[PDB]
Amino acid sequence: GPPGPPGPPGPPGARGEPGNIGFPGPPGPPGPPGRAPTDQHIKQVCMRVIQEHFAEMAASLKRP
């Protein structure tokens, strides 16, 4: 009697490994610049200095 037919195909193979982690991101951008003084701030500091050295101004401006 004739031979039988070949079997069914084998089962699907094993699911592959997880892919690797992606590259790290680029460094963030630089921070914002520090603030520069406004005109009004500058005036306010000058007046402070005047007041803080008023004594020295008076000693210098003293008459005989």
Partner 1 sequence: SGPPGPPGPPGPPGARGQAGVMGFPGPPGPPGPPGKEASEQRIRELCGGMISEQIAQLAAHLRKPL
Partner 2 sequence: SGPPGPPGPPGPPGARGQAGVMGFPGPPGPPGPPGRDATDQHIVDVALKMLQEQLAEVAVSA
Residues 2-41, mask of contacts with partner 1 (x by CB under 8 A): xxxxxxxxxxxxxxxxxxxxxxxxxxxxxxxxxxxx-x--
Binding status of residue 58 toward partner 2 by CB under 8 A: no
CB 50 within 8 A of CB 57: yes
Binding status of residue 64 toward partner 1 by CB under 8 A: no
Cβ-in-10-Å burial (0-12, 13-18, 19+) of 19 comes to: exposed
Binding status of residue 51 toward partner 2 by CB under 8 A: no
Residues 2-41, mask of contacts with partner 2 (x by CB under 8 A): xxxxxxxxxxxxxxxxxxxxxxxxxxxxxxxxxxxx----
Question: CA 61 to CA 55: how far, in whole Å?
Answer: 10
